[PDB]
Amino acid sequence: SMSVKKPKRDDSKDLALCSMILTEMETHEDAWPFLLPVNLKLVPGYKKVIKKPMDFSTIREKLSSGQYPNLETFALDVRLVFDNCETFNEDDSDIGRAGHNMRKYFEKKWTDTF
Ligand SMILES: O=C(O)c1cccc2c1OCCO2
Ligand SMILES: O=C(O)c1cccc2c1OCCO2
Numbered sequence: 277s278m279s280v281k282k283p284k285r286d287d288s289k290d291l292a293l294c295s296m297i298l299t300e301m302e303t304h305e306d307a308w309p310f311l312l313p314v315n316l317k318l319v320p321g322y323k324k325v326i327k328k329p330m331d332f333s334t335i336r337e338k339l340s341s342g343q344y345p346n347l348e349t350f351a352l353d354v355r356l357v358f359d360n361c362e363t364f365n366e367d368d369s370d371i372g373r374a375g376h377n378m379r380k381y382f383e384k385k386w387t388d389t390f
Contacts, residue, residue: 290347295339297385301354302332304381306374310357326364330356347390354382 301307313331316323335353337343344350361375 287347291339293389294344294347294350297382297389298332298336298339298354300385301378301382302336304378306377307332309361309371309374310378322364326360328356328360330360332357351386355379358382 302311310332312333314322314326314329316329322329330353335350335357338353339350344353358375358379361371365372365375367373367376
């Protein structure tokens with residue numbers, strides 16, 4: 277509360293570390309369904325169903341232009357990519373399995389890093 281603060285966690289490296297995690301996700305071999313925005317003109321249903329589209333390139337742009345206030349808002353967008361994936365894809369499909377794999381991969385990196 278006012279004039280009563282927890283000891284200050286060092287956040288100076290957060291930007292750099294999130295960029296690193298994002299790079300490892302971009303270079304993962306199962307990253308391909310998530311590298312670019314879903315084409316809303318060529319994928320019937322997606323625009324109406326998925327209220328907040330998100331992909332790694334959009335995250336990269338937001339990260340690089342100072343649009344994440346903190347590392348929690350970064351993690352939310354990453355998770356949004358995989359939540360979107362589950363909403364639109366069968367678990368038993370290549371894309372559906374890609375999403376499950378990448379989420380696991382992300383969350384481990386996330387815990388190990390912070
Ligand atoms: O999951 C999060 O949003 C988050 C935010 C700050 C620090 C963390 C976090 O996740 C676990 C590791 O340490
Ligand atoms: O992909 C799935 O496992 C799944 C999960 C919940 C509801 C469903 C599902 O697939 C077919 C439609 O209804």
